[PDB]
Design a protein around this ligand. Structure first.
Ligand SMILES: [Mg+2]
Ligand SMILES: [Mg+2]
Ligand SMILES: [Mg+2]
Ligand SMILES: [Mg+2]
Ligand SMILES: [Mg+2]
Ligand SMILES: [Mg+2]
Ligand SMILES: [Mg+2]
Ligand SMILES: [Mg+2]
Ligand SMILES: [Mg+2]
Ligand SMILES: [Mg+2]
Lengths: 175, 109, 201, 123, 139
RNA sequence: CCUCGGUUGGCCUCGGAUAGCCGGUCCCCCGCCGGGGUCCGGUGCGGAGUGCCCUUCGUCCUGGGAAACGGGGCGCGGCCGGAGAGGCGGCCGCCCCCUCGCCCGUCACGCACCGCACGUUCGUGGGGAACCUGGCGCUAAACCAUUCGUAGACGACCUGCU
RNA sequence: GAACUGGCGCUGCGGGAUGAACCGAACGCCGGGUUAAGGCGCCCGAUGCCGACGCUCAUCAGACCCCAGAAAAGGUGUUGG
RNA sequence: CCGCGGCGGUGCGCCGCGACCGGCUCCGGGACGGCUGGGAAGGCCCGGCGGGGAAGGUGGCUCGGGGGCCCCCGAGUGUUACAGCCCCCCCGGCAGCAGCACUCGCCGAAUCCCGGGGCCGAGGGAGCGAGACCCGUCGCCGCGCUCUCCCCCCUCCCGGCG
């Protein structure tokens, strides 16, 4: 699985009605995939691991994006995920602050890739919750819970280094 | 009493790393350092002006030592000005890092 | 630019400065880089010195006189770095090399000119503040350069002459600031038009 | 006005910049954003392209060219052109005199310096 | 040092990006890189914007963090920013930077003629100030 | 005359910091100029290189504004500054000129070459033989040969000769 | 020394600096356009994007299939769990 | 034989410019519609009757720090106060609607118009009709007008014109 800006898909599936249980149970899951094609394929991967059913012995009954309920309020997300490193695999819990839950999972994929070098195919996210700041655990997020939060912007590095590329005056950083 | 043409530099023919196609030339125009700026110059006529020993007839004038290889700008070449152009006869390699005028000819303005 | 382009190597990063210069000289545009002893190289001083001490050890053992020429002056050090970025073995590259000029300090055809600085190669913007760097001039003096002291003296003498020029410029600019303070009614209709057009906010 | 052949009939106010009633190509000129309203001016009907078409003389009954045609090398301004220029300019000069310092603007010659570039310029 | 900080209710100027040149006041801070900015009266709706684009200004509003949009616009209306800014020295500086770009060919002629006199009157009169300064022969 | 082509306005300079800078002023102290400390401003730099300066159609009537204390003369004579690669720059006195040149106006003309490109500068370019033209000037060395042996395979080197 | 498929031999071209076999792709002589694998500081065509998020300081740093150099075991160096 | 004659084809001695038409391609504007959770949120109507909740804790309080017992900062206080936030509403109303306030999609029988840059011009007797006769301005396809009559608005050799 590659990435992009991740999108949360709810996928509902079931086995074909065999003439033994004409109404098989319906199964719903939350898949985070770049598009509905990948989301459907990821659905069978988790379901076949979970319960004895294959894509051939089943079908998708619904696959639609889950728009963020409150994409205009900052919130803290707690992601429970497991992944396999070069050694054996591990269970892990991380916290992120973002407007959209898909944006949090994207952050988790990059943060996991940046720190533990875990490629996206190595990661399985099992749980994503909206976590209240009082219940947050990571100090990286706890430091952002303050009504009178205050910080300057110390080093403003020049980013227009080539417009112009030649100029008599050296830039200044403090503002 | 006026420069009347844009000043550009012959940067080299279009090429890969080991294959070069002399039938198009890459010109860097001073003042354009992005793709979107190149839209102005995308059709204009570019001229390479040089001198020689023998005199050559000059239209609207007396014979002189100046000769010109004409051409016109085709399309932008990559993310920062440096548009690519085609000439009637492929430019000599001695003109690399020399002046090519962009002559403000047929204007869409 | 038809005129030669003078650059102040003080505060500049060796490779970052040379890569810009090498392209700038491959397209004509004669270029001069003054104050080569002010160039900075990223990384702590000791590890950069070892990098040059390694280069001293590269030498044709059968006949070192034909081996690599380890130039010691900071200008020659910077000039050699550009030489690696150009096709010096081809005619086009050799011609580009001749367009370049490198100087320690600022000799006196160039100190009377407005120096230029490239931001894409500045140590202030390209290096994190909590990183150790090294001066080219100090490194050169420690690998064989014999003119750290004399250049520093001559450079200081140049700086004092510049201050006199700068005090005169401020004197004449203050005098001009007073001037527009005097002529106000004979200028108001000319100031205003430039104000409608963005000049002199 | 633009002519029937597509060539733009333009004039310089001859007393100002030495450009008479003359055609010019549309694609070979730069149109600026500065306009002067020339409504209710009278353009004579006899200014077709056939008027400004170049007249040619040589070569009537000369096959072997040895005695050179040293005459007609001077294109003469026909008096008819003189009156037309004065007629059209008569009603256009006082109108351009209204907007300030247009004459000096039109007397000047457009040019590029070692600063500005044409793409950045808004004409 | 550090005259201005990133507070809740701090007005910043969006230098580059989709809303380049607009004005905006942040509502909340996120992950040290993005801020919940929102400008109701500057025609930029509430959204997350990175800290790398905006330009910090001395203007500060007072309202609770994560306040709803109705509270920001009234705090923007009272002690209104578009008149303090825009008739602040920074704003007329960039807007005059805009006027220079829009200048047409005829305008460029008038400025060139006007600037010719402008410097002519200065240059021919500074020579009177220097010659007036030459009367210095005291011990 | 033979040959080489480039280019198509100039910027005449603080030192530098970046978790800071820039400009201005009132008091103290360095042999009537600088250095400190207060105070005042600007700081997405506007005393801004995203900047500044010049800007060219030429003239003729013709007024209004700028200036008159000015310009241009390779015209002269003299002074001063710069040594890192000064190869440069600045300033006084004399003499010719005109209120001309810079903005806004009045007035009309110039080949207006009839749609067309290499146009426009640097530039009186660099280089090579040569004629005329005036003035001011100078009248030498090297190598061979011959000696020397502080030198030497030959060259080379050290040497001497009204 | 065998099995299946492909290739080299018989094969040029783009990339891997370099290379019979790898990756892309197979070839009449050309113009335009677009790609593959691979790349876009400079050599060297192309990121001269106000690219996004983090990690990392090395007194032998690291830098891309085949591939051209490394292990067991350690660190109160830092990061996450 | 002459006309700088026309009509046909065939050309230009070199160097060029332009026009529309068509094929191919890369881009740029402008507008329309569908679907979705018959979009999610969101904006205005101080949202009105409220109920409930907590803290990234408003006001008010307590202790500790400064400026002329008065005014600002920090730390504990909780439920609305001299701020706010979230859920449930008994119910909402209006506008717009994947927004020309650029938060987040997939699409076009639910899709059309206009423009720009570049390369190209290959081919050469298409006349079922007259019995071709100046040269086929022709097939397919899409159109317009006339062999029907009225009106309406600019006009026009106009007819005198005020
Ligand atoms: Mg093969
Ligand atoms: Mg064999
Ligand atoms: Mg075979
Ligand atoms: Mg290869
Ligand atoms: Mg290799
Ligand atoms: Mg091709
Ligand atoms: Mg490469
Ligand atoms: Mg390149
Ligand atoms: Mg729509
Ligand atoms: Mg044909």
């Amino acid at each position: 699985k590659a990435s992009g800006t991740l999108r949360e898909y709810k996928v509902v599936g079931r086995c074909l009605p065999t003439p033994k249980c004409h109404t098989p149970p319906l199964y719903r899951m939350r898949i985070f995939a770049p598009n509905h094609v990948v989301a459907k394929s990821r659905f069978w991967y988790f379901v076949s691991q979970l319960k004895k059913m294959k894509k051939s012995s089943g079908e998708i009954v619904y696959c639609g994006q889950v728009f963020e309920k409150s994409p205009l309020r900052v919130k803290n997300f707690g992601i429970w995920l497991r992944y396999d490193s070069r050694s054996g695999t591990h269970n892990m819990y991380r916290e992120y602050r973002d407007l959209t839950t898909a944006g949090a999972v994207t952050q988790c994929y990059r943060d996991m890739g940046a720190r533990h070098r875990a490629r996206a195919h190595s990661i399985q996210i099992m749980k994503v919750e909206e976590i209240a700041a009082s219940k947050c655990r990571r100090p990286a997020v706890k430091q952002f819970h303050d009504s009178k939060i205050k910080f300057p912007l110390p080093h403003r590095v020049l980013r227009r280094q080539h417009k112009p590329r030649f100029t008599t005056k050296r830039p200044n950083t403090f503002f | 009493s006026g420069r009347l043409w844009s000043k550009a530099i012959f940067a080299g023919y279009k090429r890969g790393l080991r294959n070069q196609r002399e039938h198009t030339a890459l010109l860097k125009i001073e003042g354009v350092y992005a793709r979107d700026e190149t839209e102005f110059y995308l059709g204009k006529r570019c001229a390479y002006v040089y001198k020689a020993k023998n005199n050559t007839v000059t239209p609207g004038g007396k014979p002189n030592k100046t000769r010109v290889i004409w051409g016109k700008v085709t399309r932008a070449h990559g993310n920062s000005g440096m548009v690519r152009a085609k000439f009637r006869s492929n430019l000599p390699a001695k003109a690399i890092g020399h002046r090519i005028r962009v002559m403000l000819y047929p204007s869409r303005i | 630019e038809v005129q030669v382009l003078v650059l102040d190597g003080r505060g500049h990063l060796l490779g970052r400065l040379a890569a810009i210069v090498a392209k700038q000289v491959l397209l004509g545009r004669k270029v001069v880089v003054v104050r080569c002893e002010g160039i900075n190289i990223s990384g702590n001083f000791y590890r950069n010195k070892l990098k040059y001490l390694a280069f001293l050890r590269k030498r044709m053992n059968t006949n070192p006189s034909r081996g690599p020429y380890h130039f010691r002056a900071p200008s020659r050090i910077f000039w050699r770095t550009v030489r690696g970025m150009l096709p010096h073995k081809t005619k086009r590259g050799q011609a580009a090399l001749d367009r370049l000029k490198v100087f320690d300090g600022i000799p006196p055809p160039y100190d009377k000119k407005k120096r230029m600085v490239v931001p894409a190669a500045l140590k202030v913007v390209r290096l994190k503040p909590t990183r150790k760097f090294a001066y080219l001039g100090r490194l050169a003096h420690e690998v064989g350069w014999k003119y750290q002291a004399v250049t520093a003296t001559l450079e200081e003498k140049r700086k004092e002459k510049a201050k006199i020029h700068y005090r005169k410029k401020k004197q004449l600019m203050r005098l001009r600031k007073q001037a527009e303070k005097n002529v106000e009614k004979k200028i108001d209709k000319y100031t205003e038009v430039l104000k409608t057009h963005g000049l002199l906010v | 006005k633009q002519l029937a052949s597509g060539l733009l009939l333009v004039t310089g106010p001859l007393v100002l910049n030495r450009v008479p009633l003359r055609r010019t190509h549309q694609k070979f000129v730069i149109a600026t954003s500065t306009k002067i309203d020339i409504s209710n001016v009278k353009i004579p009907k006899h200014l077709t392209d056939a008027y400004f078409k170049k007249k040619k003389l040589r070569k009537p009954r000369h096959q072997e060219g040895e005695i050179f045609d040293t005459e007609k090398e001077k294109y003469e301004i026909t008096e008819q052109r003189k009156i037309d220029q004065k007629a059209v300019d008569s009603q256009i000069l006082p109108k351009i005199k209204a907007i300030p310092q247009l004459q000096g603007y039109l007397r000047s010659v457009f040019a590029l310096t070692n600063g500005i570039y044409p793409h950045k310029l808004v004409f | 040092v550090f005259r201005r900080f990133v507070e809740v209710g701090r007005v910043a100027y969006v230098s580059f990006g989709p809303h380049a040149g607009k004005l905006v006041a942040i509502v909340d801070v996120i992950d040290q890189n993005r801020a919940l900015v929102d400008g109701p009266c500057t025609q930029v709706r509430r959204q997350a914007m990175p800290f790398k684009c905006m330009q910090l200004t001395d203007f500060i509003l007072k309202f609770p963090h994560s306040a709803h949009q109705k509270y920001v616009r009234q705090a923007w209306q009272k002690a209104d920013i578009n008149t303090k800014w825009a008739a602040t020295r920074w704003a007329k500086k960039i807007e005059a930077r805009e006027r220079k770009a829009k200048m047409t060919d005829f305008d460029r002629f008038k400025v060139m003629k006007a600037k010719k006199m402008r410097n002519r009157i200065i240059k021919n009169e500074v020579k009177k100030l220097q010659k007036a300064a030459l009367l210095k022969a005291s011990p």
